[PDB]
Amino acid sequence: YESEEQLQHRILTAALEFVPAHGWTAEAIAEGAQSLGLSSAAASMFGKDGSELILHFVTQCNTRLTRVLEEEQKLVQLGQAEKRKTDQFLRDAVETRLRMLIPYIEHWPRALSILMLPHNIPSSLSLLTSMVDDMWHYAGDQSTDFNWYTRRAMLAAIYNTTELVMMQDSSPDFEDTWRFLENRVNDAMNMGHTA
Ligand SMILES: CC(C)=CCC/C(C)=C/CC/C(C)=C/CO
Ligand SMILES: CC(C)=CCC/C(C)=C/CC/C(C)=C\CO
Ligand SMILES: CC(C)=CCC/C(C)=C/CO
């Protein structure tokens, strides 16, 4: 027994395994359904342009991030890890989140162009905003903050800038991307005295 919303969630999760081979397409969705033992006809629950699969992927990545940040916070509470200052915390959080893209990196510029279509932009912006909100919550944010916008605008700019750099990066294990991110974070957290 399971609801329709749950059923569609499970199919789209399974479809992700096939995006590397087939792109953000109905074909990936149909392979996902079949990999679960359902009919390929279950792809007909979804559109053809890939928007639902991509938005599903972004949401899932944001959920995985919060679970990672929760786990890391628990290590801190048990005395197994140091509490990181904000610059290192943010660098690690953005890296954790962007690494989730590595298996899909050849397809990620295409996904970004689809997330920017007019009918997707409100949802893509909500998801970005929720992501940076979450990151700041675990970085130690207070419920009430006069710097609410500045913090989120800055962190969104670091994230998106680094994402663009990563789509050009051929260095081993994206070395050059994480060095860029480190510099962007260090400069944003100490903007008054940057080079
Ligand atoms: C603020 C503008 C103009 C674009 C950002 C919206 C966008 C392209 C989001 C892509 C997906 C993303 C970065 C998700 C993070 O949760
Ligand atoms: C690759 C495509 C089609 C779009 C790039 C995604 C965006 C919106 C990048 C701009 C984000 C940025 C560099 C800073 C925050 O606005
Ligand atoms: C774009 C901003 C600042 C917030 C997301 C818009 C919104 C309230 C969506 C409801 O799901």
d(CA 61, CA 98): 9
Chain breaks in the chain (C to N over 2.5 A) after: none
Number of domains the chain is built from: 1
**CA nearest neighbour of 51 among 99, 130, 110, 126:** 110
**CA atoms of 160 and 111, how far apart (whole Å):** 14
129 CB under 6 A from ligand 3?
yes
Ligand 1 centre distance from Cα of residue 90 (Å): 17
Domain CATH for 102: 1.10.357.10
Structure tokens at 69: 């940040």
Through-space distance between the first and last CA atoms of the chain, rounded to whole angstroms:
60
> In a 10 Å sphere around its CB, with 0-12 CB exposed, 13-18 middle and 19+ buried, how is residue 63 labelled?
exposed
Cited resolution, angstroms: 2.0
Taking each continuous run of H as one helix and of E as one strand, the counts in the chain are 9, 0
Domain span holding position 112: 4-193
- Tokens 């995006």, located at residue: 19
Ligand 2 and 7: CB distance under 6 A: no
Between vectors from CA 188 to CA 61 and to CA 139, what angle results, nearest 5°?
50
